[PDB]
Ligand binder design. Structure first.
Ligand SMILES: *[C@@H]1O[C@H](CO)[C@@H](O[C@@H]2O[C@H](CO)[C@@H](O)[C@H](O)[C@H]2NC(C)=O)[C@H](O)[C@H]1NC(C)=O
Ligand SMILES: *[C@@H]1O[C@H](CO)[C@@H](O[C@@H]2O[C@H](CO)[C@@H](O)[C@H](O)[C@H]2NC(C)=O)[C@H](O)[C@H]1NC(C)=O
Ligand SMILES: *[C@@H]1O[C@H](CO)[C@@H](O)[C@H](O)[C@H]1NC(C)=O
Lengths: 63, 49
């Protein structure tokens, strides 16, 4: 998202065919991908299997 | 997962990211060095014979 690669802080990224969520590994509880679920590390040109998606910023959605 | 119930599939590169988080190293270390780590494993396996 925006040229940056986001990895989950704890859990996995999953898709139900259409939408992308971030869930814990041992129990399916999907959640919206925000900047509190993920952490940024580097750019998108180095990870094999990266996908474009929207990572919602709580702060930028209010300010 | 197969030793504690049903066998749940998972891609091997993502499986190794789990096992890197189990030793205190973040998972972006693996995805950004995946080719190097793959070559180190293959070389280390070939030295056993
Ligand atoms: C994947 O999950 C999303 C989020 O729950 C689903 O989107 C909802 O789908 C229902 C049923 O079609 C709609 O009533 C809602 O309005 C949808 N919500 C949004 C925010 O779009 C989506 O349908 C799921 N996809 C599949 C293939 O099951
Ligand atoms: C970490 O160590 C590895 C393994 O020694 C380094 O990768 C080697 O880099 C040299 C050049 O410096 C190449 O000739 C070798 O082929 C590489 N090895 C493999 C297995 O790919 C790597 O550069 C080191 N990382 C650093 C110093 O940041
Ligand atoms: C979406 O992903 C493709 C690779 O699958 C990449 O080449 C492209 O630049 C991305 N598009 C955007 C808008 O980032």
């Amino acid at each position: 998202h925006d040229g940056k690669a986001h990895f989950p802080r704890e859990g996995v990224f999953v898709s139900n065919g259409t939408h992308w969520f971030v869930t814990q590994r041992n129990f399916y509880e999907p959640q919206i991908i925000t900047t509190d679920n993920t952490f940024v590390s580097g750019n998108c040109d180095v990870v094999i299997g990266i996908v474009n998606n929207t990572v919602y910023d709580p702060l930028q959605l209010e300010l | 997962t197969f030793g504690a119930g049903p066998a749940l599939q998972i891609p091997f590169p993502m499986q190794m990211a789990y096992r890197f988080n189990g030793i205190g190293v973040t998972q972006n270390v693996l995805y950004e060095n995946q080719k190097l780590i793959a070559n180190q494993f293959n070389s280390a396996i070939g030295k056993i014979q």
